[PDB]
Design a protein around this ligand. Sequence first.
Ligand SMILES: [C][C]N1C2=C([C]=C([C][C]OC3=[C][C]=N([O])C4=[C][C]=[C][C]=C34)[C]=N2)C(=O)N([C])C2=C1N=[C][C]=[C]2
Ligand SMILES: OC[C@H]1O[C@@](CO)(O[C@H]2O[C@H](CO)[C@@H](O)[C@H](O)[C@H]2O)[C@@H](O)[C@@H]1O
Lengths: 407, 554
Amino acid sequence: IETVPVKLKPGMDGPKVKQWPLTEEKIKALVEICTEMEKEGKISKIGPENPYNTPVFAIKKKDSTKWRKLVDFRELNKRTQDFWEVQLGIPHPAGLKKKKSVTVLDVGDAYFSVPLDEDFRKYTAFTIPSINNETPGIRYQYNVLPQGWKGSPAIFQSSMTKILEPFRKQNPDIVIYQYMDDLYVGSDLEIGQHRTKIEELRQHLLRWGLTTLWMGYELHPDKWTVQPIVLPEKDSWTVNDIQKLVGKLNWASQIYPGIKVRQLCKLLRGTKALTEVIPLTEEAELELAENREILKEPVHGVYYDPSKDLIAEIQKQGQGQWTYQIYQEPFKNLKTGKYARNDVKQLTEAVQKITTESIVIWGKTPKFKLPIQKETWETWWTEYWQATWIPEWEFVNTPPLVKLWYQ
Amino acid sequence: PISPIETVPVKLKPGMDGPKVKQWPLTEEKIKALVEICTEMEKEGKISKIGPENPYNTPVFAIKKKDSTKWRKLVDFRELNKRTQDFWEVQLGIPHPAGLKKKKSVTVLDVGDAYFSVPLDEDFRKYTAFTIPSINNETPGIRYQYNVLPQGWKGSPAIFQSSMTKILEPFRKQNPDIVIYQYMDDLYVGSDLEIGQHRTKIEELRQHLLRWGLTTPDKKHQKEPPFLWMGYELHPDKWTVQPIVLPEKDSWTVNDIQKLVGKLNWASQIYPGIKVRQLCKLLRGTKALTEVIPLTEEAELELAENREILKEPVHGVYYDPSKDLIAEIQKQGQGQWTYQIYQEPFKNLKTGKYARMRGAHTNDVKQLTEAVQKITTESIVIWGKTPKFKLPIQKETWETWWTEYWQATWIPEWEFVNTPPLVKLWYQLEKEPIVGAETFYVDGAANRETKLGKAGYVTNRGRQKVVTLTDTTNQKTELQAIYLALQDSGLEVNIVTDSQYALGIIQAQPDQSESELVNQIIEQLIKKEKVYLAWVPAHKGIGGNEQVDKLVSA
Ligand SMILES: [C][C]N1C2=C([C]=C([C][C]OC3=[C][C]=N([O])C4=[C][C]=[C][C]=C34)[C]=N2)C(=O)N([C])C2=C1N=[C][C]=[C]2
Ligand SMILES: OC[C@H]1O[C@@](CO)(O[C@H]2O[C@H](CO)[C@@H](O)[C@H](O)[C@H]2O)[C@@H](O)[C@@H]1O
């Protein structure tokens, strides 16, 4: 109980994002939820004198039937970055990604107990729309730390430390990391022992008022072996197959130093038929083998730049399979992977899984380049979305070639 | 009256102070009209005389709107508006008639002198100060400041609307079954009560409104059905767009055609089949608004099709939440699509149309998907739910397309309905190289300086041709090279290119395009029986690709 001064720091103005139309069942759920929060004093109805706005959605909780409010604070987060990142930044432990098991626990409830600086509340304005625009629309702003805003964990940081203090000293080798409204807990314990430590942690949290598919509850990071670029292993090779191989090796030669393809270019001499069988000379069968070894290893020369944005590209491979790459410098892969099971549902799931690994490895979410039409994504993503955060995203057209290389 | 409702605190933008515009000397008559008008307002509490301590000021002006007899006060709030804080938007969107639930009765009530009946934040009034200049500006003018929301001020629409919302709240809670829509200074009230208890509940509303400073017409001056609103004509059991009259002209000007397109687009909301493509084409290019545009034969045909649709009046029905929502779409032709939404077979809630994106390579399946998406978004806005679709495409055709395409595509629950023309893919590319078919290695280069270019190929059968292009681009030459290969090949063919750009366009099975080149290539692809297209790295001296990159570069 003691507000922490918050400032956008002269230059940027509050968020003025438009609210998205929502289905009747989500609007009703938001109205029930917001009416309760108002009685409880967490939010207050506001007037037209507040020119700010942030979109709000309703997703389904870890449960199955329990509706939850999700506020899209992506703009406000970017506009208050100096506050949550520079002034009260929360350290990311490099040890987290090395643990055998990492469990994710929702702790967003805690924030509702801490009052928000009265002069910052107006920037948390949001609107609950009505069907067919028949009534003006219910406007509210927050009176306490809201979920979704990166400033909340930043301000609640000192309280979180006190709460986890005894648990940490009792379990020195367990790594606990807070990112937005979630807590990431990693250990090398046997699964049964790990689960028991988590239950104990929930009990610690319960004393402070915290009732804490793509699987975002129990992760196994030290087992996230990269999805190599694979080179076929055939009995016979057609011209076509070699050309495919040269194309794939040529693309990999821009990422992995040491990739050689001269021996194969030799096999493709002249103007031959695509179906013609070409015998593999041992001089090239050697090059093939040597390239397989470079490809199953980490990319030499690529490192994470803390000051740069993480980018995630995703390709639809078909049959419920999806490939993805995370990088900062185009094609300089920091990580590659895959996800396998409708299309939109599968994409949202892959996106949530990729964001989670990213949070574990670097302590930040990547900006996604999605292979889907803007409106289709906007209309359907909340029907399956279950995370409490929302990453930055762009809508793009996948270059047919890239899909082939990462197959 | 001036409502007793609490005021909305208002402020100027940070770092800015109130306006201080100099009052321009006015003629004697305008000065007299102003003094008369201000005295009337002063006695009713709308404005108050202020001392000379208030340093702010805004220009005032008097206008006799016509050769009439009534003078009107016109305050120039441009300067104050630029200094006033920003406000939240009044409405996020406008209600569509198709989304209105059926009621036994609907009544309209307009609020008299809406803005003047709402109080202005005391701490902000000082900024509205204006001055009635004395004759020839010899002596000190008469100073006033507003106590209510001024006409023309930036915050009035918003503050008035939120005031009306707070005032209605109590009455809504006590009558959760009554429907009240706020539109500027109008109120539309509907209920499922018998004409008797309805007129009663209304009187009770007026009474409630009056207790808050808002006067309304009595049961004697309340307008009668149908209600004209936002360009719609609303009746008790149906709705339609206000009467649309298609101009009968010999010579059509750019101005007349824009107005025509506008009316057709508005009519397309309930009149099925309206088309505007050929009419919009006429407006392409830069032309004088008063210039005569001769109608092409296609535009004549389209205009006649529309006149026919608009001859017999059509209407839409209201929404019944207990029934379901069905949407049907029909291909009308060249990139044009039309749809109808209904609950009970053929009683349209509303209709619409969709036109294919311009300057883009596409096919019928993509356009349908886009149309479905457009309708889905609109349905959620209007009824808060997605409708069930009835599409002119086979389940197998759709499944073949989406499972193959590299982009994530999804359509809500739909059924196939056989209403020709049907949506289909006109050709498909092979998944593997073809045996017994000639392999064409194509390529195209274009000197960026001279704009000159060459397109050619080399085959595994020794054939090889090379044409020359003028004022072309590297992209266009890659396309021409593919076109030459298709034109000189047999029914089956393997084409190897190093143009990712070309591969991209072709793998998507485009059926329509504005690019003559792409259209020619499409014409050839449809004639083929089997076409396999492969990609090879540009300048890697790869067999075939290299032997042709020569004859093309030189
Ligand atoms: C009250 C909200 N209101 C509304 C209307 C019509 C119906 C559909 C039912 O229409 C009826 C039913 C019975 N009547 O006696 C009617 C008389 C006139 C017009 C419509 C009528 C339902 N609600 C309506 O007219 N208007 C302008 C309207 C509205 N709500 C939002 C925008 C516009
Ligand atoms: O879906 C993109 C679309 O969403 C909006 C708000 O409705 O912007 C949000 O998403 C962007 C991309 O991740 C963010 O950059 C932005 O800050 C966030 O509000 C629209 O602006 C955008 O077109």
